């Protein structure tokens, strides 16, 4: 599993919060590919910040900074 651990029902819940009524069977795999690309992009950058700071632990701040520079500023984790 892993990526396949992100389930049809979970993807459907997400779709529903985004206002989606009806879903093509091919959507679940499209969606997983997209989520993978999103995480690759954000994680690459976060890990690059971890490495700079000489740490073995990815912190919330590593993630937060990575998100900000991807134009995806997240509030709530700057402690």
């Amino acid at each position: 599993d892993n990526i396949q651990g992100i389930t049809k029902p979970a993807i459907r819940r997400l779709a529903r919060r985004g206002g989606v009524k009806r879903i093509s069977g091919l959507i679940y795999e499209e969606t997983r590919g997209v989520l993978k690309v999103f995480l690759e992009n954000v994680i690459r950058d976060a890990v690059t910040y971890t490495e700079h700071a000489k740490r073995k632990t990815v912190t919330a701040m590593d993630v937060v900074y990575a998100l900000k520079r991807q134009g995806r500023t997240l509030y709530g984790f700057g402690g």
């Binding site: 389930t7 979970a10 206002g19 959507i27 995480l39 994680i43 912190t59 919330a60």
Partner: protein
């Protein structure tokens, strides 16, 4: 006859239910697995603060939810009510994620 709701009746009910709540919609552990797996390709032997993983889930889900909104707009533009891969593909191209 036993009782059945028409197709689309329950879908609408979940839209109303999920747009009212804020809880995360992907299971916590499988997401954690996926995250660690991707990170392992960039650097081995990594640990994560637990708030690091949650920042990543908050951001990922907010991204997919807003993407689903744009996708839905592209379906409707084509006079459908069913989202397809081509609707996702159009939304991402226009966002500049594929362009």
């Amino acid at each position: 006859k036993p009782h059945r709701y028409r197709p689309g009746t329950v879908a609408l009910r979940e839209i109303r239910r999920y747009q009212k709540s804020t809880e995360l919609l992907i299971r916590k552990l499988p997401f954690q697995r996926l995250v660690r797996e991707i990170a392992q390709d960039f650097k081995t032997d990594l640990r994560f603060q637990s708030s690091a993983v949650m920042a990543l889930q908050e951001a990922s889900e907010a991204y997919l939810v807003a993407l689903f909104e744009d996708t839905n707009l592209c379906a409707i533009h084509a006079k459908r009510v069913t989202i397809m891969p081509k609707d996702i593909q159009l939304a991402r191209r226009i966002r500049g994620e594929r362009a």
